[PDB]
Structure 1
């Protein structure tokens, strides 16, 4: 494997069509994943729409966050009520913590973590993965954790099961049903050719994280970066992994 000098503590890049590792560093290490959890919440939202259990146009009230510091949709709009479509866009695009919790509550109430982890097993994720919340925010002091290998299995299964997820994560700005314009946290859209996903994350404990995906000429790769040192270093690391991915 190439000799990369990454900021990330754990990182990897995988080819989708065979699951093969093209670079791996601490790929089995258990790491806090924070807002990367929202990829599982997105998975279960799409599963529910497909199962005829959830309407894109159903209106929901944003739940209040326990911590007023976490990034939230209500804070930048002062609007309480949103469609499921808009909450799902806000969750994926700006990483709105209140939007994710609102979707998880609608789906399964206080039993959403069980459904997150059941889906994890069903997707092939190892017992090292444990979700605690739809947003990835800590719950009663417990943290969402996974490994880079497991996050690849989740990401690849999400994209193969629900490829329309990329219609949202590929956009640098999503104009919601209501009207608000949400800016993507994915600073690499329009920078790396073919890159169209997937999701950022950050807490003090998780460091700066990013799951990226790109496709060129039929070949799609997924990169995982956990615990990089700054908001831009997780993308610098991702640029290195994507060049390895398409070597």
Structure 2
């Protein structure tokens, strides 16, 4: 294993072909993951469409967040009603917390965190992973937590089960049918060849986090960065991890 000098406190990169570690640092350490939880919500949304339980065209009113200063789709647009499709894009591109919570409530109401943790178990994530909400926001003072190993297993399961997730996470901007522009938080899109995902997150406690995925020559790698120092440094660590991934 090479010696990287990452900003991140915990980090890794894995090959999807065999799941094997190409670089690992604190890969078993339980870490706050915040907005990365929205990948589980996306997965459960996609499962529900395949299972004939959710329509992409259903219109839903955004649920109201307790904190106004939270990053929310409603704050930016002043529009309450959105299709399931647009809420899912809004969740994945701009990390809209109210979008994620609206999808969680529609899927299972108050039991949605249990469904998230049920699915975590199905996908092979260890018991150190705990989801608390569809958006990744704290609930009753409890935080969503995971490990870079469990995040890898979740991400590759998401991409292998629902490859169309990347059709959304590869776009620097998603334009809805009615013309709303939803800007991705993934500034590495277009900077690294093959890069088409996956999800950013940030809290004071979690630091700056990003799950990256790229594919070249039939080889896919997934990179995990938790608790980088700045929004830019999580992408610098990811650039470093991707080079190790495609060596």
TM-score interval, normalised by the smaller of the two chains? over 0.9
CA distance in 2, matches of 1:16, 1:159: 10
CA distance in 2, matches of 1:38, 1:85: 15
CA contact (8 A) 1:199 1:211 kept: yes
Structure 2 matches for 1:59-78, cutoff 5 A? 59-78=59-78
Structure 2 matches for 1:96-115, cutoff 5 A? 96-115=96-115
Q: Alpha-carbon deviations, 1:57-83, whole Å to 9, x = none?
A: 000000001111211100110000000
Q: Alpha-carbon deviations, 1:19-59, whole Å to 9, x = none?
A: 00000000000000000000000000000000000000000
CA distance in 1, matches of 2:177, 2:85: 8
TM norm structure 1: 1.00
Deviation at 1:8, TM superposition (A): 0.2
CA distance in 1, matches of 2:177, 2:122: 32
Aligned residues: 247
Tell me, which stretches of 5 or more residues in structure 1 are unaligned?
none
CA distance in 2, matches of 1:67, 1:20: 41
CA distance in 1, matches of 2:65, 2:217: 43
Q: Spell out structure 1 runs of 4+ moving beyond 3 A.
A: none
Q: Equivalent residue of 1:28, what SS? A: coil
Q: Equivalent residue of 2:198, what SS? A: strand
TM norm structure 2: 1.00
Q: Equivalent residue of 1:110, what SS? A: helix
CA distance in 1, matches of 2:126, 2:11: 17
Deviation at 1:94, TM superposition (A): 0.3
Deviation at 1:178, TM superposition (A): 2.9
CA contact (8 A) 1:43 1:158 kept: yes
CA contact (8 A) 1:86 1:178 kept: no
Deviates most, 154-163 or 64-73: 64-73
Q: Alpha-carbon deviations, 1:134-180, whole Å to 9, x = none?
A: 00000010000000000000000000000000000000000013321
CA contact (8 A) 1:83 1:177 kept: no
Deviation at 1:12, TM superposition (A): 0.1
Q: Alpha-carbon deviations, 1:187-218, whole Å to 9, x = none?
A: 00000000000000000000000000000000
CA distance in 2, matches of 1:144, 1:78: 29
Tell me, which stretches of 5 or more residues in structure 2 are unaligned?
none
Q: Equivalent residue of 1:197, what SS? A: strand
CA distance in 2, matches of 1:21, 1:95: 28
CA distance in 2, matches of 1:186, 1:152: 18
CA root-mean-square deviation: 0.4
